[PDB]
Amino acid sequence: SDPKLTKAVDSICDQFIVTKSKISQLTEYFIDCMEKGLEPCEGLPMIPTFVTDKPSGQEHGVTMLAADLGGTNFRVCSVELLGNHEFKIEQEKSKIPTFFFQDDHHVTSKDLFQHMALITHQFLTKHHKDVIQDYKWKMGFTFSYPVDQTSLSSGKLIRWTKGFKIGDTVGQDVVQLFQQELNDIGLSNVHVVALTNDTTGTLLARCYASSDAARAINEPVIGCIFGTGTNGCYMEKLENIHKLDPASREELLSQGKTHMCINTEWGSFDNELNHLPTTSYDIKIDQQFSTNPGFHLFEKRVSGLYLGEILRNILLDLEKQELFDLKESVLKNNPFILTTETLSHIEIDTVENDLQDTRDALLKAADLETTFEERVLIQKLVRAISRRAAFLAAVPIAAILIKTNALNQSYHCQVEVGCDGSVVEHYPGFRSMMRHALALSPIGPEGERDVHLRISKDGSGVGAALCALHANY
Amino acid sequence: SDPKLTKAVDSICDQFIVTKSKISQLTEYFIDCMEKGLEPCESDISQNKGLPMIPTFVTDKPSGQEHGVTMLAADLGGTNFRVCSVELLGNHEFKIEQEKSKIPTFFFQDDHHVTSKDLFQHMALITHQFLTKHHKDVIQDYKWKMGFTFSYPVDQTSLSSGKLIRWTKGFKIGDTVGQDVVQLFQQELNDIGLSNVHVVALTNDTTGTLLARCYASSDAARAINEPVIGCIFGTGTNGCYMEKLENIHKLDPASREELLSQGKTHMCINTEWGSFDNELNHLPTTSYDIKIDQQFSTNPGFHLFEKRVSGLYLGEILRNILLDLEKQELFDLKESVLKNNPFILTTETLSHIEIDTVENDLQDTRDALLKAADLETTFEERVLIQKLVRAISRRAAFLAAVPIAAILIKTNALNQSYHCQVEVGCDGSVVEHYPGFRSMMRHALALSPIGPEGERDVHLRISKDGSGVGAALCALHANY
Numbered sequence A: 001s002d003p004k005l006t007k008a009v010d011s012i013c014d015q016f017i018v019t020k021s022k023i024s025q026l027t028e029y030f031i032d033c034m035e036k037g038l039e040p041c042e043g044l045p046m047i048p049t050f051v052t053d054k055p056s057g058q059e060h061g062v063t064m065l066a067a068d069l070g071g072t073n074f075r076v077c078s079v080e081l082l083g084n085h086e087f088k089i090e091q092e093k094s095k096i097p098t099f100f101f102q103d104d105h106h107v108t109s110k111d112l113f114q115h116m117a118l119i120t121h122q123f124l125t126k127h128h129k130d131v132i133q134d135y136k137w138k139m140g141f142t143f144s145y146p147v148d149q150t151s152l153s154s155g156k157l158i159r160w161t162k163g164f165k166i167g168d169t170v171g172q173d174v175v176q177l178f179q180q181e182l183n184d185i186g187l188s189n190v191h192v193v194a195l196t197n198d199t200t201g202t203l204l205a206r207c208y209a210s211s212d213a214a215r216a217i218n219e220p221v222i223g224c225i226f227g228t229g230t231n232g233c234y235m236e237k238l239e240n241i242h243k244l245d246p247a248s249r250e251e252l253l254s255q256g257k258t259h260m261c262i263n264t265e266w267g268s269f270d271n272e273l274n275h276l277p278t279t280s281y282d283i284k285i286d287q288q289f290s291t292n293p294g295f296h297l298f299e300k301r302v303s304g305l306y307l308g309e310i311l312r313n314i315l316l317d318l319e320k321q322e323l324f325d326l327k328e329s330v331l332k333n334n335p336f337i338l339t340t341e342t343l344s345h346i347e348i349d350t351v352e353n354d355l356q357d358t359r360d361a362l363l364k365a366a367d368l369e370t371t372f373e374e375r376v377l378i379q380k381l382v383r384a385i386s387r388r389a390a391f392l393a394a395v396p397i398a399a400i401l402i403k404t405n406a407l408n409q410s411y412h413c414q415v416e417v418g419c420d421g422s423v424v425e426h427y428p429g430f431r432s433m434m435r436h437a438l439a440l441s442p443i444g445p446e447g448e449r450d451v452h453l454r455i456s457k458d459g460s461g462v463g464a465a466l467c468a469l470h471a472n473y
Numbered sequence B: 001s002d003p004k005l006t007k008a009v010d011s012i013c014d015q016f017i018v019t020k021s022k023i024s025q026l027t028e029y030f031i032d033c034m035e036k037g038l039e040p041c042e043s044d045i046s047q048n049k050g051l052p053m054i055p056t057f058v059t060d061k062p063s064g065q066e067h068g069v070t071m072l073a074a075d076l077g078g079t080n081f082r083v084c085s086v087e088l089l090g091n092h093e094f095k096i097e098q099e100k101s102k103i104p105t106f107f108f109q110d111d112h113h114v115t116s117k118d119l120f121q122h123m124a125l126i127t128h129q130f131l132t133k134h135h136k137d138v139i140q141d142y143k144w145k146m147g148f149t150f151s152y153p154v155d156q157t158s159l160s161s162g163k164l165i166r167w168t169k170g171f172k173i174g175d176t177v178g179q180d181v182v183q184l185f186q187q188e189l190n191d192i193g194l195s196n197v198h199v200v201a202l203t204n205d206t207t208g209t210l211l212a213r214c215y216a217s218s219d220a221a222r223a224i225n226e227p228v229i230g231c232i233f234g235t236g237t238n239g240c241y242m243e244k245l246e247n248i249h250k251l252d253p254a255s256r257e258e259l260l261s262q263g264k265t266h267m268c269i270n271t272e273w274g275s276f277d278n279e280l281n282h283l284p285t286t287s288y289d290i291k292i293d294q295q296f297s298t299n300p301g302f303h304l305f306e307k308r309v310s311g312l313y314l315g316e317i318l319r320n321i322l323l324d325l326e327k328q329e330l331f332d333l334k335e336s337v338l339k340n341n342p343f344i345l346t347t348e349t350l351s352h353i354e355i356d357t358v359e360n361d362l363q364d365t366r367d368a369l370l371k372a373a374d375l376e377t378t379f380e381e382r383v384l385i386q387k388l389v390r391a392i393s394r395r396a397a398f399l400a401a402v403p404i405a406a407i408l409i410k411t412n413a414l415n416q417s418y419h420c421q422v423e424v425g426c427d428g429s430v431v432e433h434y435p436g437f438r439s440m441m442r443h444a445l446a447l448s449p450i451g452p453e454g455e456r457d458v459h460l461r462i463s464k465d466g467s468g469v470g471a472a473l474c475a476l477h478a479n480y
Helices: A003-015 A020-037 A109-127 A174-184 A198-209 A246-254 A280-287 A297-302 A304-320 A340-347 A356-366 A372-403 A422-426 A430-440 A444-448 A459-469 B003-015 B020-037 B116-134 B181-191 B205-216 B253-261 B287-294 B304-309 B311-327 B347-354 B363-373 B379-410 B429-433 B437-447 B451-455 B466-476
Strands: A060-069 A073-082 A087-095 A137-143 A147-151 A154-157 A190-196 A218-226 A230-237 A259-263 A414-420 A451-455 B067-076 B080-090 B093-102 B145-150 B154-158 B161-164 B198-203 B225-233 B237-244 B266-270 B421-427 B458-462
Touching: A003 A304, A003 A372, A020 A372, A020 A430, A060 A109, A060 A459, A073 A109, A073 A459, A087 A109, A087 A459, A109 A174, A137 A174, A137 A459, A154 A174, A174 A190, A190 A198, A190 A459, A198 A218, A198 A230, A198 A259, A198 A414, A198 A459, A218 A372, A230 A297, A230 A372, A280 A297, A280 A304, A297 A304, A297 A372, A304 A340, A304 A372, A304 A422, A340 A356, A340 A372, A340 A422, A356 A372, A372 A430, A414 A422, A422 A430, A422 A451, A430 A444, A430 A451, B003 B311, B003 B379, B020 B379, B020 B437, B067 B116, B067 B466, B080 B116, B080 B466, B093 B116, B093 B466, B116 B181, B145 B181, B145 B205, B145 B466, B161 B181, B181 B198, B198 B205, B198 B466, B205 B225, B205 B237, B205 B266, B205 B421, B205 B466, B225 B379, B225 B429, B225 B466, B237 B304, B237 B379, B287 B304, B287 B311, B304 B379, B311 B347, B311 B379, B311 B429, B347 B363, B347 B379, B347 B429, B363 B379, B379 B429, B379 B437, B421 B429, B429 B437, B429 B458, B437 B451, B437 B458
Parallel strands: A060 A137, A137 A190, A218 A414, A414 A451, B067 B145, B145 B198, B225 B421, B421 B458
Antiparallel strands: A060 A073, A073 A087, A147 A154, A218 A230, A230 A259, B067 B080, B080 B093, B154 B161, B225 B237, B237 B266
16 A cells, blocks of 8 residues: 555564574574583573472472562562472562662662561461461572572672662672571571572472473473563583582582583573674664663563564654654653553454454554554564564574483483463464474474473472472571 | 394384375375265265264353353263262363262163163262252252263254163163153253253263363463364274364254354364274274274274274284284293283383383383283393384374364364464373373374474363363353
């Protein structure tokens, strides 16, 4: 209907295409960054988590509690391990005040961890009134942030993310700080025994929830997240974790341990952009509309937070060319007004319904009245953004499986990949497009059929509880 | 160690291979038998060369968001009677209470003058006893909708009307033959004061496997991930799917039009694919499949496809191969007890061999054969026995995939949306528990006409208890 605008959209969509050649390149380059990352500091982060055992699913008769500090909520839960892949969970939820995300000179780290301590006291008083001060509680702490973890219960914050501005916390042991405030309110009997990442929890949770005899050939190997951010972990041979001091590496091998879970934090993959597909829109977003410019570049191309923003910048560039009319819309100066959920309604909308689900999504999101011919092109852009995100999201998984020869161990060898996150859970077709990229990746179609992307929820709870199980009070 | 025996086994293993060329042939021939089976009776063949293709009269699928309601189900097997209550909690979750009971021996006696009334009166009392136990307070107020699972040959004329054809599994009640079992069961439910319990549905256990997965399909949104097939792969096999009302030409036009007038568009078809290609025009066949179908079978000449996929016969096939290898002085059975003990080799025995590794001298296989038939073996023998087991199981999984691929192709299930995906509800000792069976099925699906891109959009998820929860869910969308 409008050949001028149409040709413009066709050109932009082609910039988001990820060819089989590129998947091979990025998969090979990812393994290179993996090995470089396993060396002493001077590649990927590659952070040892010090988790060496996998839950069997038969741990029972014990009750653990765990604390999870997300980006917008604080969470306290109690996980009763009942064995047979079943568990009871009770919890109390608390919001994080908004003044912690601004750089108020009056807000400090202590005020944050004191907030966490009081909620613990309020939660324990709610469900376990009789054992609040006597029980020898073992607590698992899920701190889904960049951390330089030196042991299972010691980790200093490296840098805040997800909109946080508290400088006094950086470079300080977050577990000890949290423990300092738990003693002050009279809960000295609560010992923070484990410091885990949310990916480490996603994996252990699926190990406990997996099947007894199916796991003889179907072993969970990766725990990853695809939501506001992205990150993944896997088990690595102790011999390859050169960051680990040899004494501790030797001590674990002599104890029957063979692997240790590595928190790759692959969101920081190829921060130099030697190979990641990049467009003027990814650059304009990385420098201006980013909270930590220059960091987590791979995450910004796959995170559900930035997917909506990418579309917005495309439309603004199209208005600059007098091709698209925003009229009374409110996109001109409203970053992140386009959300991952908004695009979801566009992904699966049908042209048989004049793309009605998309018109309403745009009106509700930015009062942007549209025509049928416009939504058809907007749909093409959304489907191209999601497809690149799903294709890139497959590279880390394929690289990890290749580097560990997980797919060729037995006659009927299969592997599971635990996933959690608004994108992979609910964004329509995301997993479907991931499986497609896995088929185009070096593992091949025969490799994908032996890979199962099963979703495992509540990693920050059961997973953190299991880490405290094998820890000493 | 023995090149003669090795070469013999490699030749036998090659007889069980199913090539991509064959998968296309069988998938295409299956759809032909599907269409022939849907035509009016008495055409070329007495009832068409095609499959049975039996309408179940189930037209609605649970959405998974139904809540606040409790449904009942009754299941009459060969040796037990079962009554359960399924409370739907929405969000793909549900509560289930049940009581299972043995069938009194008085029904198996001779000369006692047993009649249908005596049987359904017992079922009514058991139902009343169950409702008094778990739903004491609402037994007489609730408008209970019950689904009836009657595991016997039935001529189903509607969703709630079906006449018994013949007793099986050791039953002798003449009053039942040719009578609506739903009406009989309903007659006695009214007498004991449960007139408010309406048997609204008479269901098959395969149809329930599908409906059960419809409610439990929580992973994907149904806008693009719709369950389409419910099948069974255990001792027997069978599957079902939704067919357009217009293609069920055997269906009476009067009943067909009335359903169209209610907004219904599809009806679940009980294919009974176990009887697929009983003429063996194309089904892979070996001397072992023939000797087992005629001698060690209970119904020779019938259910040929079922005997190629049933977990019961997989172990037997191995036995006949080893006996044939001993008859040729190639394999030494020694003190084994295979000579006259059919089915002594079970699917469970083969399971330990399927995934056993040669890195451990195949010890799980050495032990499995000793416990099963006191057959002492050598390492070189177990290597070949494993090759035979893995070849037999692979043929069964490849053949089990043909019907699924055939149904998906005939219904364009994979080409409905941009991100269209489908689920297949499965139950059965073989598909559920035989190691790798599901994995080899997906491989055959990739080699089938749907292609590898089609397999990635097919999900073989397991849905248990079709004759209980499934029968209850069928009654959900049925009218009181």
